[PDB]
């Protein structure tokens, strides 16, 4: 019955890419949008459109991967290697703005919800706010 729909999505994504796949369809939600609307704006996906599967409104999300490779296991590097949720449903994690994580030494993003929108580690620091550290991606 999905406890935390997000960490689901987040996983759907994670799972799709391990085999490298056109797209995948998290069941839709304005918030799952918002979140996706940052994976893409930050270059982790090609992006996403709204769709349907029997009146049921999901989100077609187009993944991004690397270039082919020489040698054995020519499988591409990942645009999204790592994506693991924080502030979980069984233990919300919040943060003051000074408390905000510095993911992967700048090479990464810490998506996170706040009173002035779903910012990012830099977007929040710059906007000078904090809130539910939603997850870390890279």
């Amino acid at each position: 019955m999905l406890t935390d729909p997000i960490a689901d999505m987040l996983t759907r994504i994670r799972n799709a890419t391990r085999v490298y796949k056109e797209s995948t369809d998290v069941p839709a939600s304005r918030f799952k949008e918002e979140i996706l609307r940052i994976l893409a704006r930050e270059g982790f996906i090609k992006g996403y459109e709204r769709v349907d599967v029997d009146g049921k409104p999901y989100l077609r999300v187009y993944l991004k991967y690397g270039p082919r490779r020489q040698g054995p296991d020519p499988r591409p590097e990942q645009v999204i290697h790592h994506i693991r949720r924080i502030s979980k449903p069984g233990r919300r994690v919040y943060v003051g703005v000074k408390e905000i994580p510095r993911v992967r030494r700048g090479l990464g993003i810490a998506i996170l919800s706040t009173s002035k929108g779903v910012l990012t580690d830099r977007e929040a620091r710059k906007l000078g706010v904090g809130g539910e550290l939603i997850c870390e991606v890279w």
């Binding site: 069984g90 233990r91 919300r92 994690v93 919040y94």
Partner: protein
């Protein structure tokens, strides 16, 4: 600021007094998770005007009697016996826990 508090009347069986159960939430000092905890206050009710199940506000008042240091401020919403059950059952559960 004379500390205030909101909560449910669980006992009304006292002469000019009520028992307000107060819930309080807070993040936990090492594991984060918000945790719910609660305490009961004996509230001065000089008009027995407050009945059973009323969610109310209470003010840090001057000592009225041992154990009793809070007057009933104002009403917040009569008729919430749904919480009074939650309490009374928690209580009734205690019998199964002895020998």
């Amino acid at each position: 600021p004379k500390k205030v508090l909101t909560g449910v009347v669980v006992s009304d069986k006292m002469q000019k007094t009520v028992t307000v159960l107060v819930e309080r939430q807070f993040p936990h000092p090492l594991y984060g998770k918000v945790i719910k905890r609660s305490k009961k206050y004996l509230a001065h009710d000089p008009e027995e005007k407050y009945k059973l199940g009323d969610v109310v506000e209470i003010i840090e008042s001057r000592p009225i009697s041992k154990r009793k240091r809070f007057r009933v401020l104002r009403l917040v919403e009569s008729g919430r016996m749904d919480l009074v059950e939650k309490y009374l059952i928690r209580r009734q559960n205690y019998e199964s826990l002895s020998k």
